[PDB]
């Protein structure tokens, strides 16, 4: 149907906007602490601690399969990255501190993304 195509075009355009959001967020992580999944070879007990692991590469895979239907879904995954880190790592660590800086900086980017997703529909 033409309606299915139109909905597909909207999803494609959302995907384009989320790809630019994802690039902007990841620049706020210059140390690449959140670039890849926590390694189960190097942190073998991780899944006893964190039930839903997340990282930027895993988000990128989902994005390129047009797997985010809306910005809420994408923000959920970004918040998992931060929240998982702040539970697993103590306050006095480079890891926790990197998450706080990513949260604070990413908040700005996400504030205007929400307006752009509403605005452009």
UniProtKB/Swiss-Prot annotation:
It comes from the Eukaryota. Residues 9-113 form the Bromo domain. Highly expressed in testis. It is found in: Nucleus; Chromosome. Transmembrane segments: none annotated. Coiled coil: none annotated. There is a cross-link at residue 41 (Glycyl lysine isopeptide (Lys-Gly) (interchain with G-Cter in SUMO2)). Scaffold subunit of various histone acetyltransferase (HAT) complexes, such as the MOZ/MORF and HBO1 complexes, that acts as a regulator of hematopoiesis. Plays a key role in HBO1 complex by directing KAT7/HBO1 specificity towards histone H3 'Lys-14' acetylation (H3K14ac), thereby promoting erythroid differentiation. Component of some HBO1 complex composed of KAT7/HBO1, MEAF6, ING4 and BRD1/BRPF2. Component of the MOZ/MORF complex composed at least of ING5, KAT6A, KAT6B, MEAF6 and one of BRPF1, BRD1/BRPF2 and BRPF3. Interacts (via PHD-type zinc finger domain) with unmodified histone H3. Interacts (via PWWP domain) with dimethylated and trimethylated 'Lys-79' on histone H3. This is Bromodomain-containing protein 1.
